[PDB]
Design a protein around this ligand. Structure first.
Ligand SMILES: CC(=O)O[C@H]1C(=O)[C@@]2(C)[C@H]([C@H](OC(=O)c3ccccc3)[C@]3(O)C[C@H](OC(=O)[C@H](O)[C@@H](NC(=O)c4ccccc4)c4ccccc4)C(C)=C1C3(C)C)[C@]1(OC(C)=O)CO[C@@H]1C[C@@H]2O
Ligand SMILES: Nc1nc2c(ncn2[C@@H]2O[C@H](COP(=O)(O)OP(=O)(O)OP(=O)(O)O)[C@@H](O)[C@H]2O)c(=O)[nH]1
Ligand SMILES: Nc1ncnc2c1ncn2[C@@H]1O[C@H](COP(=O)(O)OP(=O)(O)NP(=O)(O)O)[C@@H](O)[C@H]1O
Ligand SMILES: Nc1nc2c(ncn2[C@@H]2O[C@H](COP(=O)(O)OP(=O)(O)O)[C@@H](O)[C@H]2O)c(=O)[nH]1
Ligand SMILES: [Mg+2]
Ligand SMILES: [Mg+2]
Lengths: 386, 451, 432, 113
């Protein structure tokens, strides 16, 4: 399954309205067109993505995408994938001050909530609705941030220390001593979300009054159990839902940073640059072996160059189904930056995952052998040898 | 202050202690009466090394020793000997009968009412010590006292101190030669304590040392004095790393970190290379390669076992004198190319090296020649299994008919402490057989995914 | 004013540091008692890189001495330059690690790390403009490896913006002195790859080979090894101290030598080396130094550069010489050995020139290579590691002190990932 | 450090009567000669504006060079050398080495020549 790609354009803000307000982004169907403001004679370069979203004007109906629209299109699909028993991820991308906090988290007080609240509410509604005598459900929450190559926990009370990143031999990277809280109702996880959003590190810059200063990862561990006293297996499915909000790239001239605000930004840019390489690297490999012949000789992906890419080793590739939401800026002045995002987005769809997800390998072997016995017995019965 | 407390149990322990303390007194220039005129002649120094000797106010030096036995004779020989003023007057000698080649008599009946005093004096010695490294226990299998009382003392020490190292030097019964009819019983009954409580046990055999004396030193009629002097040289070579400066110093913890792969296989052999007479000291170079090669000769082993029938699991070389690292490196390199010496496939390094500047000393009236270089090798191998197996057979030949058993049960034991011990020996032999097997072929059976 | 704090750990680190402080002290002209008795005016111009100034016109080196066995400390004090160091910087305990990395890193060193960091903070606060640190230790040992890794982690926690150098002596194929060298080396390399900007590789086999083949010595001791290593350390940081036609700070070397963050394992070398018998025959000039620097047998890491490719190299010359000759020789070395350099870094040779040679020589040069052949060394350790970890040869000693198999597994995986990251660039013909 | 430099330049300009222009000497490839030159030229263009500004810079040579990251530093100075400088003169070390070798018969020239 290839990586799913969504793109979204936001409306003008104060900085755009004060300066020149010429738009350059257009949208039609699945096609997103960008036009160079410096060269109107040039071709109107365009990209075909799996999904594109126009949030510039709300009254009109020109493919307008509210929060619920993008949520249905991406998050509901990926949640349905999760119910089938697949580890699942949605992660944001773009530049500074574009759309990540609005898209993933949104404004809680308003109806225009982000993907994470709506996914959580729909998940709680579905587990409560589909509960039965035999069926049962359990859910658990965690929320971490990467500030400057250091992992911190938000849902936990004040813990001045920094957690340690570790590597289970079979399950890959993880974060040791991460407060995984059990939750039972939508209101409680909403309270956890509010506390986590409060606990994050946020600072003001010229580009945005609430510029994020740290990457954020929100993990929901979901367990689906079927109880039977005769044949069925309990804990039938276990899934991990990972919503990732990345701090965007910054330029020192426009940002106006100095001192600490500069240094933080530098780290952010580093954590993005490596990520870009990984995406590019991954794409070529999953493009090459798939299309070239099938050689699979050797290809190195620089996962370890940053903690962000290290923790998301299974998300960017491997054992998960992943979606990438790109945020665009319609400002003409931003063109040379905006196009960059699209380029990586144009490569993001090339990436292809390998997700199967099972549990209890003893039960896996037993089920495989029992199914083989049943198939052979059915073949013998059909052919008169049983 | 790398302090070490020595404990001597039984006649063999006391006599080896006599030899060891003669060598220690000669090494640091201490007179038999405890005075050190070297500092007076010089003016001052650190020559009163706190490893073995404790200095009082008046310039006397009392050794950190604890002699124990049940016979008054062996230590009354020391109370009225040459070194009567060196030791503290307290010598922990029960004015009663002896264990009488009876483990039960030494562990249960008579071992009591003397253990408390011994532990009290060991505590008194330990209180004076700062940064105590460990214990050095001398005894002998096959004797009543050296088996039973050693077992009791080791048990109590493991209960009390616990984390301090406890090295063991013991005289194993020979294959053919023996000096008692009930040696196998006492030897077998000590396995539980020599296994569960000790950290490293060095075994020596009187037949091997007699062969070495007859062949190398050309002594046709040796006595126990020569054997004790050789064992004293071995112990001094072991302990010299924490008394004198050297290029590479090996503490008593590096010993255990490097030599014992698993907790239950801590039975290394020992050997001393330049064992040669004064007349034959000439006509020979005595270079590093020669002594290092001689350490590996089966004839020079201190226990009657052939290393060629087993596999080397770990080796620790301790050099003394005018030695340099590059000769040692060349010696190890040329050793690794010999096909007669086999190492387990799971220990590719297989060597620990230590070097000390102080050359070995010569005891007047001795028989070892003065030399410039020396090396002591301690080698953990699997050939030692043979040394158990023969003895195990002997035990069966006496236990099938319950011979000599009423003496043991009449002192406190029952027959089950006589089987449990045999089963423990069998389990230990099975462990030694299992560890030496080569890793199974491509130990992940076989592998190879797509690409 | 750039200056360096110096840390020493373990027996090997302590001895190499003692020899290093004897070499630097000559160049700058310092009496063993601490007074200055030089002749040139430029020796005192930048003496503050290494030495604090005391009241009585004395100079105290900015060194930190760390160990867990007191004995080595005594060997430092009872020596030719034992009185030069201030007593307050002798930080030590008792009951050394005993070649156990767990004791050095977790159990024993965790208590002395506070005092060591206290002394380091005290030295670094007085610094006018602290550039960076450098640590000398041995990876295959006990207290050295563990305390070095722990101190490196703590310092990078507290001083993220400063340079963190390291001079490491690692195991060798043939030369082995401890049974459990692979475990310590693997865990140390796992710790170093994260928390270090530069790491110079030193091997006893290479130094013995240089002594026997180049210097023709018959009975080399550790003094000669320390001599060569200390010459290298003095060569690396010449440009902070003395003027030159074209300077090269430590940061310049770090930037020009490291293409990606995890590839910072360098192979050092020094020239000339003449054996004291052939000194009258060879002419001393820039081409001779260039020929000797790039010679395979002159390297100090026992890894043949011909088995890989040079990602980057740096050449720091000391002496009065023409820049045109240096540039021409470096270009010729690039052109003739076309197959031993990577095809996507044009002009991958950093050059530096300093006008003040060593005291006894008219010319000298130091070579700092960064090549894929280093992978071989790591591979060797990994092989040995597996040969012990599959059967758990000595694991009870490490697990008894508060570790587990998971740390061993992740260290091995990290080492294998580094080994894979070098090979990538190793093969020619990037297309297929 | 840029503020102090501009203060000194302001003092020198105030001393000057009928100032004609600035002669800026720097070198591509080096970090300082590139970045600080960009800063100084930007601030000078903002402040003085109409005064001429001539560069004399050492462009990297085609073959020989003294650093691995020369092309990045040299390329990143294009904006400065294009928009703010009025006329920039470029010289190459290889060309001057050839001139010294052929004309002046100096076999081993150094930077002084
Ligand atoms: C030229 C001459 O007549 O004597 C030379 C000499 O013969 C040679 C052989 C010297 C000599 O080096 C050795 O013999 C040697 C032995 C073991 C290990 C290392 C070196 C020399 O000992 C070494 C000594 O080196 C120095 O004096 C440097 O300044 C050196 N400093 C020290 O060696 C030193 C040692 C202890 C205390 C104070 C200074 C140095 C090197 C690099 C960076 C800084 C300082 C020198 C020039 C020589 C002798 C004396 C023969 C050589 O060494 C150096 C580093 O110069 C060997 O390769 C060079 C080539 C020289 O020609
Ligand atoms: N090498 C050596 N072995 C000795 C010496 N003295 C006794 N042995 C050994 O000790 C064995 C006898 O057991 P002992 O240790 O003497 O028994 P014990 O210590 O006297 O205790 P009891 O049996 O109660 O008298 C003999 O088989 C000897 O091999 C000695 O001086 N040197
Ligand atoms: N499509 C949109 N419709 C309405 N408001 C939007 C939209 N996109 C962004 N905004 C608002 O515009 C501002 C900037 O968006 P924001 O999500 O904070 O940027 P960001 O993604 O957080 N950049 P950063 O946090 O630094 O990685 C916020 O006040 C958002 O609420
Ligand atoms: N070059 C050099 N190497 C040494 C020296 N002393 C020891 N070594 C090396 O260091 C290793 C032992 O490490 P060690 O110093 O004991 O570590 P420590 O116990 O933590 O101090 C051996 O493999 C030696 O090769 C020395 O003086 N010079
Ligand atoms: Mg944000
Ligand atoms: Mg007796």
């Amino acid at each position: 399954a290839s990586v799913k790609v969504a793109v979204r354009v936001r409306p003008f803000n104060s900085r755009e309205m004060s300066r020149d307000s010429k738009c350059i982004i257009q949208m039609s169907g699945s096609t997103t067109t960008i036009v160079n403001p410096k060269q109107p004679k040039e071709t109107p370069k365009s990209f075909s993505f799996d999904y594109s979203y126009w949030s510039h004007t709300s009254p009109e109906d020109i493919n307008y995408a509210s929060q619920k629209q993008v949520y249905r299109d991406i998050g509901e699909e990926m949640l349905q994938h999760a119910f089938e028993g697949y580890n699942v991820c949605i992660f944001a991308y773009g530049q500074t001050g574009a759309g990540k906090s609005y898209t993933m988290m949104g404004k809680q007080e308003k109806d225009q909530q982000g993907i994470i609240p709506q996914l959580c509410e729909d998940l709680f509604s579905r587990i409560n609705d589909t509960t039965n005598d035999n069926m049962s459900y359990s859910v658990e929450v965690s929320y971490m941030e990467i500030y400057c190559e250091r992992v911190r926990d938000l849902l936990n009370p004040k813990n001045k220390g920094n957690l340690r990143v570790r590597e289970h031999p079979l399950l890959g990277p993880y974060v040791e001593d991460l407060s995984k809280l059990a939750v039972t109702s939508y209101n409680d996880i909403q309270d956890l979300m509010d506390s986590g959003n409060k606990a994050r590190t946020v600072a003001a810059t010229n580009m945005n009054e609430t510029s994020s200063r740290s990457h954020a990862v929100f993990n929901i561990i979901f367990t689906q159990k079927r109880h039977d006293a005769e044949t069925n297996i309990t804990t039938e499915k276990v899934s991990k839902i990972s919503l990732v909000d990345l701090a965007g790239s910054e330029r020192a001239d426009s940002t106006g940073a100095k001192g600490t605000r500069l240094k933080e930004g530098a780290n952010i840019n580093k954590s993005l640059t490596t990520l870009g390489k990984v995406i590019s690297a991954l794409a070529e490999m999953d493009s090459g072996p798939n299309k070239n012949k099938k050689k699979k000789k050797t290809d190195f992906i620089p996962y370890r160059d940053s903690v962000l890419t290290w923790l998301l080793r299974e998300n960017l590739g491997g054992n998960s189904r992943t979606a990438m939401v790109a945020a665009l800026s319609p400002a003409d002045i931003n063109y040379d930056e905006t196009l960059s995002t699209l380029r990586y987005a144009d490569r993001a769809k090339q990436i292809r995952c390998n997700a199967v997800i099972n549990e209890d390998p003893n039960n896996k072997l037993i089920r495989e052998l029992k199914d083989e016995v049943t198939r052979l017995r059915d073949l013998l019965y059909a052919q008169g040898l049983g | 202050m790398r302090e070490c407390i020595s404990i001597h149990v039984g006649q063999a322990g006391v006599q080896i202690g006599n030899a060891c303390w003669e060598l220690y007194c000669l090494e640091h220039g201490i007179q038999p009466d405890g005075q050190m005129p070297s500092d007076k002649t010089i003016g001052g120094g650190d020559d009163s090394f706190n490893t073995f000797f404790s200095e009082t106010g008046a310039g006397k030096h009392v050794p950190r020793a604890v002699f124990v036995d049940l016979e008054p004779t062996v230590i009354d020989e020391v109370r009225t000997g040459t070194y009567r003023q060196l030791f503290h007057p307290e010598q922990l000698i029960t004015g009663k009968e002896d264990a009488a080649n009876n483990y039960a008599r030494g562990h249960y009946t008579i071992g009591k009412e003397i253990i408390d005093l011994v532990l009290d004096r060991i505590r008194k010695l330990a209180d004076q010590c700062t940064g105590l490294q460990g214990f050095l226990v001398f005894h002998s299998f096959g004797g009543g006292t050296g088996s039973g009382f050693t077992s009791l003392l080791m048990e109590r020490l493991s209960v009390d101190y616990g984390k301090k190292s406890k090295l063991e030097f013991s005289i194993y019964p020979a294959p053919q030669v023996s000096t008692a009819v009930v040696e196998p019983y006492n030897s077998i009954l000590t396995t539980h304590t020599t296994l569960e409580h000790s950290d490293c046990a060095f075994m020596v055999d009187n037949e091997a040392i007699y062969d070495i004396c007859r062949r190398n030193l050309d002594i046709e009629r040796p006595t126990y004095t020569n054997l004790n002097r050789l064992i004293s040289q071995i112990v001094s070579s072991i302990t010299a790393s924490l008394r004198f400066d050297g290029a590479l110093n090996v503490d008593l913890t590096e010993f255990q970190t490097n030599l014992v792969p698993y907790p239950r296989i801590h039975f290394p052999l020992a050997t001393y290379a330049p064992v040669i007479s004064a007349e034959k000291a000439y006509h020979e170079q005595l270079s590093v390669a020669e002594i290092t090669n001689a350490c590996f000769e089966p004839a020079n082993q201190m226990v009657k076992c052939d290393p060629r029938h087993g596999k080397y699991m770990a080796c620790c070389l301790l050099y003394r004198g005018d030695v340099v690292p590059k000769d040692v490196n060349a010696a190890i390199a040329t050793i690794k190319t010999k096909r007669s010496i086999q190492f387990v496939d799971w220990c590719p390094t297989g060597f620990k090296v230590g070097i000390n500047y102080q050359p070995p000393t010569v005891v007047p009236g001795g028989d070892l020649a003065k030399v410039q270089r020396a090396v002591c090798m301690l080698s953990n191998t699997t050939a030692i299994a043979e040394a158990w197996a023969r003895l195990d057979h002997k035990f069966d030949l006496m236990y099938a008919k319950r011979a000599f058993v009423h003496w043991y049960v009449g002192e406190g034991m029952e027959e089950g402490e006589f089987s449990e011990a045999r089963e423990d020996m069998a389990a230990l032999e099975k462990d030694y057989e299992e560890v030496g097997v080569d890793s199974v072929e491509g130990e992940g059976e076989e592998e190879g995914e797509e690409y | 004013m750039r200056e360096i704090v110096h840390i020493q750990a373990g027996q090997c680190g302590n001895q190499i540091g003692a020899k290093f402080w004897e070499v630097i002290s000559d160049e700058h002209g310092i009496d063993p008692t601490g007074s200055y008795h030089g002749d040139s005016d430029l020796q005192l111009e930048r003496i503050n890189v290494y030495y604090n100034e005391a009241t009585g016109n004395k100079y105290v080196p900015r060194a930190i001495l760390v160990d867990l066995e007191p004995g080595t400390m005594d060997s430092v004090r009872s020596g030719p330059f034992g009185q030069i160091f201030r007593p307050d910087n002798f930080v030590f305990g008792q009951s050394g690690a005993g070649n156990n990395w767990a004791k050095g890193h977790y159990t024993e060193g965790a208590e002395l790390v506070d005092s060591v960091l206290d002394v380091v903070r005290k030295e670094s606060e007085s610094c006018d403009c602290l550039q960076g640190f450098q640590l000398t230790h041995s990876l295959g040992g006990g207290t050295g490896s563990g305390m070095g890794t722990l101190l490196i982690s703590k310092i990078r926690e507290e001083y993220p913006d400063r340079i963190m150098n390291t001079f490491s002596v690692m195991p060798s194929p043939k030369v082995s002195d401890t049974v459990v060298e692979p475990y310590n080396a693997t865990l140390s390399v796992h710790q170093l790859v994260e928390n270090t900007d530069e790491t110079y590789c030193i091997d006893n086999e290479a130094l013995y080979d240089i002594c026997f083949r180049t210097l023709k010595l018959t009975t080399p001791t550790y003094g000669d090894l320390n001599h060569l290593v200390s010459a290298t350390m003095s060569g690396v940081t010449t440009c902070l101290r003395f003027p030159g036609q074209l300077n090269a700070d430590l940061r310049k070397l770090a930037v020009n030598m490291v293409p990606f963050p995890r590839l910072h394992f360098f192979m050092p070398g020094f020239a000339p080396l003449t054996s004291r018998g052939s000194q009258q025959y060879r002419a001393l000039t820039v081409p001779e130094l260039t020929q000797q620097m790039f010679d395979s047998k002159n390297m100090m890491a026992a890894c043949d550069p011909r088995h890989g490719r040079y990602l980057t190299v740096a050449a720091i010359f000391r002496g009065r010489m023409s820049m045109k000759e240096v540039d021409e020789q470096m270009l010729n070395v690039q052109n003739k050995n076309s197959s031993y350099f990577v095809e996507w870094i044009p002009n991958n040779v950093k050059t530096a020139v300093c006008d003040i040679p060593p005291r006894g020589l008219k010319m000298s040069a130091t070579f700092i290579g960064n090549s894929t052949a280093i992978q071989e060394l790591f591979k060797r350790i990994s092989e040995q590691f597996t040969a012990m970890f599959r059967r758990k040869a000595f694991l009870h000693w490490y697990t008894g002190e508060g570790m587990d198999e998971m740390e061993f597994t992740e260290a091995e995986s990290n080492m294998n990932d580094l080994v894979s990251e070098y090979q990538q660039y190793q093969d020619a013909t990037a297309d297929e």
